[PDB]
Design a protein around this ligand. Sequence first.
Ligand SMILES: *[C@@](C)(CC)[C@](*)(O)[C@H](CC(C)C)NC(=O)[C@H](CCC(=O)N(C)C)NC(=O)[C@@H](NC(=O)CCCCC)C(C)C
Lengths: 196, 196, 198, 198, 125, 222, 233, 212, 204, 222
Amino acid sequence: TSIMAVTFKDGVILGADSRTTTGAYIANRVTDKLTRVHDKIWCCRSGSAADTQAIADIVQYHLELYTSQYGTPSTETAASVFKELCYENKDNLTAGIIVAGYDDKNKGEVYTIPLGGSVHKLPYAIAGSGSTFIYGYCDKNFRENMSKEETVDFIKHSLSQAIKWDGSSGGVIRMVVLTAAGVERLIFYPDEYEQL
Amino acid sequence: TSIMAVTFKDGVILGADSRTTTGAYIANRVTDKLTRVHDKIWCCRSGSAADTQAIADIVQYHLELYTSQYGTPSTETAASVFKELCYENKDNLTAGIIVAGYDDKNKGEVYTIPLGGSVHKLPYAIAGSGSTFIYGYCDKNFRENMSKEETVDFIKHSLSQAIKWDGSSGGVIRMVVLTAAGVERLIFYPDEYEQL
Amino acid sequence: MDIILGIRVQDSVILASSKAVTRGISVLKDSDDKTRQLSPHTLMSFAGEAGDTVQFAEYIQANIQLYSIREDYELSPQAVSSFVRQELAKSIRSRRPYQVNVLIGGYDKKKNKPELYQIDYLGTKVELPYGAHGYSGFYTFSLLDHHYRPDMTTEEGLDLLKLCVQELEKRMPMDFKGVIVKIVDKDGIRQVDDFQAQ
Amino acid sequence: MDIILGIRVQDSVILASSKAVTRGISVLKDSDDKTRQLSPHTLMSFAGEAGDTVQFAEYIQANIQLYSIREDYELSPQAVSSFVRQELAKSIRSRRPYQVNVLIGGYDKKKNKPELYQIDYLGTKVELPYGAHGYSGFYTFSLLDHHYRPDMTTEEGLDLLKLCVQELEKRMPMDFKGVIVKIVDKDGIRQVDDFQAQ
Amino acid sequence: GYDRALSIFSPDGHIFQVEYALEAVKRGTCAVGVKGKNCVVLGCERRSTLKLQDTRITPSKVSKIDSHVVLSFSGLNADSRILIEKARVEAQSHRLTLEDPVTVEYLTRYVAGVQQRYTQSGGVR
Amino acid sequence: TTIVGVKFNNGVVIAADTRSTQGPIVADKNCAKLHRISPKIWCAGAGTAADTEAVTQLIGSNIELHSLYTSREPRVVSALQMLKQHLFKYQGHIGAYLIVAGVDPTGSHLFSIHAHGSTDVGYYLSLGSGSLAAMAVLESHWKQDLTKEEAIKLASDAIQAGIWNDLGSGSNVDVCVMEIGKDAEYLRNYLTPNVREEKQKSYKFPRGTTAVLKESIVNICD
Amino acid sequence: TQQPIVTGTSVISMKYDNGVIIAADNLGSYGSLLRFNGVERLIPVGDNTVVGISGDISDMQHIERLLKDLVTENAYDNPLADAEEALEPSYIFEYLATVMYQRRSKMNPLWNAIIVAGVQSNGDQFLRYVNLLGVTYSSPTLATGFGAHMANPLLRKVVDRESDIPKTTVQVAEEAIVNAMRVLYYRDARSSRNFSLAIIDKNTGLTFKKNLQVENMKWDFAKDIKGYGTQKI
Amino acid sequence: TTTLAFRFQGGIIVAVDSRATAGNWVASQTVKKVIEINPFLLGTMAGGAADCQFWETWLGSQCRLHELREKERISVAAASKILSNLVYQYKGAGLSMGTMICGYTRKEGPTIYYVDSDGTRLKGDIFCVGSGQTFAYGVLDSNYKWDLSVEDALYLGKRSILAAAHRDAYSGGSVNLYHVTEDGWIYHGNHDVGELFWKVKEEEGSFNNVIG
Amino acid sequence: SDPSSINGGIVVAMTGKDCVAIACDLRLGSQSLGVSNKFEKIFHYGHVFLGITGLATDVTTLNEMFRYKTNLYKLKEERAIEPETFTQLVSSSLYERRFGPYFVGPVVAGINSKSGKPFIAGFDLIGCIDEAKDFIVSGTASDQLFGMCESLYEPNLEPEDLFETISQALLNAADRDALSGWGAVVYIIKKDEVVKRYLKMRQD
Amino acid sequence: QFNPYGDNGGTILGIAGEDFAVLAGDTRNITDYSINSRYEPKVFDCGDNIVMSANGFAADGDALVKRFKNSVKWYHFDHNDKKLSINSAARNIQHLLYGKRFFPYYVHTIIAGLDEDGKGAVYSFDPVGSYEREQCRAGGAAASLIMPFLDNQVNFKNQYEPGTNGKVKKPLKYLSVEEVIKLVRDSFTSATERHIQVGDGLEILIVTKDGVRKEFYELKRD
Ligand SMILES: *[C@@](C)(CC)[C@](*)(O)[C@H](CC(C)C)NC(=O)[C@H](CCC(=O)N(C)C)NC(=O)[C@@H](NC(=O)CCCCC)C(C)C
């Protein structure tokens, strides 16, 4: 798996590959790893599919109940609920979640939650097995306040490299754009991104 | 350890960090990992320091005896001697050698010899624990037939990123330039390459 | 391990049980009675793990005595054996099982028939003309297959136990220090006090 | 394991050795002589691993007999014991060591003294007034510490072994099927053929 | 559970539920015991309000607690069974731990303890 | 153990503490850890003590023979090559960890050698349980172009850091100074900052305190 | 029982004549990956206490939230919450020590080593250590991890016993701390160049310094190092 | 440890050594391995020192509760079974106790019960328990008669512990003697093996084994 | 498990004024079982004395080995082996079996016949020489011996006083070890004569 | 796997006089081969003229002391400020220890004070609650070095009256507080020489009918 989320001028973009393997066999080549927990709060999932699916569903439940009582939750609050579940059940979970969201006040935000259940607010985040190969690339190429098109290009170039080298990554590059305008689903096929 | 060798218009350049660790302790912060086995055939060492030193010394011996009988050996010949030692003793060795050399006919050449003892001729090669973090960067940034100054910049930038992310890498960046003009030793200190 | 033998003849069940109690390198006792009377006409012998063996037998004894008082009636040997089997079967899937093997020799006053039941620590019950637990069976069963007859008198039964004990004393590695022998018949339970030199 | 006892009295050495040979669940023999005569006045008893025990004994016997013929002379008990200790000490760091414990009882004709040596499988030699190998020592050493005197007659030594054997027949879990007793003195080696009911 | 204090003190210092339990005893069929020098004899009466009973199977008023101890009573028949069962269980428990049957005083002290407990436990009469 | 090497402008100095241990017990309070490979090539060892002493004497022996055979002063690189090839052959089973230092016709040299056969080169080095304490001092005070007096001081301060702060190190400081032109000078017990204080009492017993069963004269002569 | 994932390395500290200094770098490692570079491992509590934490960062953040709750809870129904009944360094520590030992006793430790530095109300210096085992100790200098092996030796050369404390100044103490952070950057493979340093002074209060860097490093001698024995060029 | 207890014509003799060990380290030479439950009841200790010490002290409290409650001294059988049943509840938890409960009551006469942490409970006339039990058995069995004098019986117990103290490395220190009769237990002193060995060697002529 | 703890035993050596002392217990056991109380652990080759603790079979074998070697030494050299030189022979003989070592703790004691100088030394099982001016200890009660020696010892003791110190070091150390004791023997060694004393001690 | 135990080293020593008792212990605290503190007291005045040390794993030692101190506090609350006699403290500590029989306090505990006749008393504890009153006892890392020295010098073991042919023992004439202090100080200098976990400082608590007094002495710091 190769996943990332990048803040930019207008908000935030989540990116992911679509490959899930059991050993060397690709059990799913069109997986959707970009998961909605609220209107404009989404997450990228890595680790045990069972675990991250269960986590995300519980988080989505909490934020639905939060909204009913107290109105729209902040991205921080969503990250806090992920953290609470991951940290308190660290012995029985293998989950690496990136939480990304947009609200009008704070703009775009990215919180990464590694294996232990710690939380780290970052300008951008990368995770999944494929991410190791793009630490160098991303650190030399990321800039703050990029445009939507620049950010889409940064994610597309980054994940294409992660996919190129990581066997556990592949398929299509999915993105989810989060801004004041709303939510936009993007998808990029092998014939485009391999050529980069 | 982070090591690489890059061919270019005039020949080839080997680059390496200077950190060797036993656990989390840095036993040597000024290690020289670029090892001469012949006038214009050098190698980058990764893995067991005992193993790679023993391998290089045996190779140096063989290339000295070869020279005494048949004249200057080709870089391919040096790689083969490395391979023979690594492949035939694969059970008792943990060595990742990159072999680099310049002769007048073939120009600069790079051979990488991974753990198992296989040989791969490449335009450039990266190895060591820090290499994982720069597969993306080096793939997007390498070009063939670069100038000396461009190749030094490419190795310097790549190894600064490898050092940045890999705790097992660090110290100074050593380089060795192999061309018709001879052998040039270069060194770059933290205050320079961390700023990149 | 400890020797536990049983034999049902025409009118009685005879139980023979070794007298040795050994811990490690030392024989601590050579007169141990590995048996409990559960009711006037039902006798149980036991062998297995050190503490479990007596704790189980006494617990069974207490329960059968309780039943006898409540109902003013002695349970049949078949009923007692079934109760014992169920208790063992419970323990095998419990936290710490009773590691005890038993024989139950009884005289059914309603049927006027002697009855012998072999039950292992798993709750494996079976009704037999003769029975053994542990390694002792590996010698005695074939011996009894040959010499046993169903119409034997109590005295012929005792002669047949002597033959079994002599074979065990010859071929078994352990010194089990002889046996205590008890007869269960229509008149209750009595001990053959002079088996050491009979 | 097998019983191997030895005692040095005034004018002789007495070796007592159990007669049982047991494998697993069966006593295969009850008249086994766990000893070899090494020379006219030197006797060795042995106990340990199944095959190694007799193979070692016979190997030593052959070597001492070879020395005797070459030199037309009998090696002293001390010399024979030192030869045996070295052979054992060699094997312990070899590929597959001899797992054999021995007692060597001999009468030194030059000194006119009886001598008893105890040697374990490691090559640990020691000269003693009395000795035992394995678990038997845990019972006999304290018994002999009490009742042993260095000026005893051969007849008193045999009474003392009787007391050791009775203690082992009371407290040891194994049935070792009694012992064969042999006496080593100035007139050679003889077997006490009536120890079963002495 | 249900824990209502049913046995409580009244202003005059009586526990009416215990004293009303005694009235149940008064209604019960007569029972008598006399000690000899070498025996004890327990006598009870049987009613004649209804006759046509099977005396083989109808529970008798004298119950064995152990081979050496007997218990008769007067009052509620159903209540007596609970005491008798508990007494018999305790008898076997005593033989198991002490390796000796109960004394008559101890068996009595146990039964009396059970009865007492039901006078200051919640939810029971 | 704490051992250090320090190069200076005209040579190299090595030092070591003097504590030898068997587990938490101190066997020898004044062990000499500075061994000689050749007159002007000295050696300090850590790890398995028998292995460091044996391997230092074997190579020392072969080096003497080599020196005689070639009619040349022994070189530190020869000691290095012979030590590492021996150790490598035994795959770390010879638990020898050495700082080797000396002077020869080609100049002054300082190397470290690990049990598996790897070697390092440096201007200052430390090994043993007290390695980290000593290195902290070396990394805090080392400079290029040290004088002999400054190097002895620095090396000696580095051993002290090990003595006081490491439980595996203690007692005294031994030093050997190897200068290009001159003879090597071994400074046995260069410092002695751990003298045991005067005891509160004497435990000399009155004669006849010990009970004796038997007494005899032993024969040595023949 | 657990294993640490995201980790912080050494925390180093010492007392001086008028107070205490404590420092720790800004790195959250993930094995040998130097993953997070903006991690603050010094946690101030009020104006008189700084807690430095090494080990598992997820646990550090949990401990961080416990300390904020302590401040809140202390201010409840407490008119003297910013005066006589404010939290002392000793209270903060004893609370943490209690928790650390109870968690180890439950076979579920907070996988950390903690140093609480501060000044008590009476002016006394407070410096005490506690870790995942619940082990506690005080010393004129304290350090965790590699800092114990490399920093303590250097810091103990300045303050070797109690009597060296009144003789040691802030300037001398701070310089010694800063030098030790450089030494740890040289030889600890899980260290960062960037660190935070905190001074708690009985007169001048809490001085928290962020974004410090190791400077004045010696590397030039590396150019003269070639080969590993016999190589000359 | 070595401990023994045996019945004879004149009641019960009880003898124990006094050595404590942790591995090969000699922890103590002065441990009291007899516990005085009441004037007619004794218990011996072997195996885990804390386990024996703790649960036999507890046993004492349970025996004292019995007296108050039943207005009568507890039988040896009942006292031994309290401990047996407690120990059985812990079976598998790793308790380590080899124990003898010795005493006199009117009903039972002189009685000895062996109780151990496996849950084994045995009534008997002779018992030796602990790492040196075998050595004591050798000397006790070969010299035991029912018709020994109180003088000869006390000596036999003493001499049997001495035997084990000598041969068993984990036994030693001193010998503590007791004698139990209808009237209760009588302490017959602490006997240091340091002096007892040489005294016995000389007077008895035994232990030729040793360089005298 | 540990070949150094099967048989038990101790050896201790001390220097004094123009004298040395070396002592040992007499026990030979097998785990808990005591087997022999006659098992002496001190040997001598000419004027050089060698104590050996540890696995008994190796104690015996090594004694025979060094008897063998010092005999050939004397025939070739035409003089008796000296303590300094014998220490080196033991060290090199032990290291010869580096990867299959004798499980022993030898101790050398003597006086050089030329210089008159008291000499003691100890070794680990593979030959690392512990040279000490004051005392050397070995065996299953080595911790105890270290404690007694460090406390009781003072330099320049006369033979009569050294006997008391070494005897009492050994005795009290043995009595805190289950596997040591069962009798003891002390050698007081001077230039001209050597006295051997058997000590009275606990037999438990 | 998480190991809930550690070893903080150090050593403690308790000696009981005729009308006094002392409990001593070094002030060094270590982990592996590093010093945690040169001065971390482990011997405490618990009230009611009882001094206590629980040495080994310090976190268990502190917990035990803490619990015992609290036990003394509640004993006053629950029994009309009655003094906790030394024998009563000892039995109380047995139950504190045995309460954690299946997850033990990894310590050797020693307490000292006076008994109810004014005689000096020392009680020493097995890690799971086994105890006995003694004349002297060493505990902790160097216990195996100091105990035999105490047997010899406090209880006069193996010492006979000169000239009595080893038939009359040296009598048990008992020591003054001055003589006891000398043995304590000599024991701790001996242990500091030979055990690497012992040193830095000695702190002795002396108990009399007049209360508890403290004395401190420097020990070697290597
Ligand atoms: C004999 C010495 C043979 C071993 C005798 O059985 C002793 C009993 C009396 C002292 C009551 N046993 C020993 O002294 C114990 C031998 C070890 C045990 O058998 N075992 C089950 C622990 N020694 C002690 O009990 C020592 N206690 C410890 O071993 C407990 C430590 C637990 C680790 C946290 C202690 C009293 C020296």
